[PDB]
Write a protein that binds this ligand. Structure first.
Ligand SMILES: CCCC(=O)OC[C@H](COP(=O)(O)O[C@@H]1[C@H](O)[C@H](O)[C@@H](OP(=O)(O)O)[C@H](OP(=O)(O)O)[C@H]1O)OC(=O)CCC
Length: 104
């Protein structure tokens, strides 16, 4: 189950753009200390920090690779590399939030 994973992870996620062009774009992502850090395309720009206490993971109904991360002012649309990395990301995000709640 979720205990097959820890509460930290460094990797990449596909993040869907929006507007005239909606495409998947690879971004460096990391989870640590209850925070999801999402890098921008430009690598010297300060990354977005999402407090996982006030976010909700919504796995995809269908494809076992896509998931949303609902934050207070935005929904991020993510896609993992495959089934197994999807399970890893969602498990780590979950674990991180649970740990953060214990400590709050
Ligand atoms: C018009 C001139 C300005 C310009 O550069 O316009 C040309 C752009 C192509 O640019 P892009 O590289 O696709 O830009 C990305 C998207 O806006 C994406 O939605 C955004 O994520 P988010 O902000 O929604 O999450 C990314 O931010 P980070 O992920 O890095 O934060 C951002 O890098 O559009 C076109 O292809 C033209 C037709 C629309």
């Amino acid at each position: 189950g979720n205990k097959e994973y820890g509460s930290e992870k460094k990797g990449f996620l596909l993040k869907k753009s929006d507007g005239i062009r909606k495409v998947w774009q690879r971004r460096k992502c990391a989870v640590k200390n209850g925070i999801l850090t999402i890098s921008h395309a430009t690598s010297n720009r300060q990354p977005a920090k999402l407090n996982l206490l006030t976010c909700q993971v919504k796995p995809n109904a269908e494809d076992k690779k896509s998931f949303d991360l609902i934050s207070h002012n935005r929904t991020y649309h993510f896609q993992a590399e495959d089934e197994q990395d999807y399970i890893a990301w969602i498990s780590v995000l979950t674990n991180s939030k649970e740990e953060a709640l214990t400590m709050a």
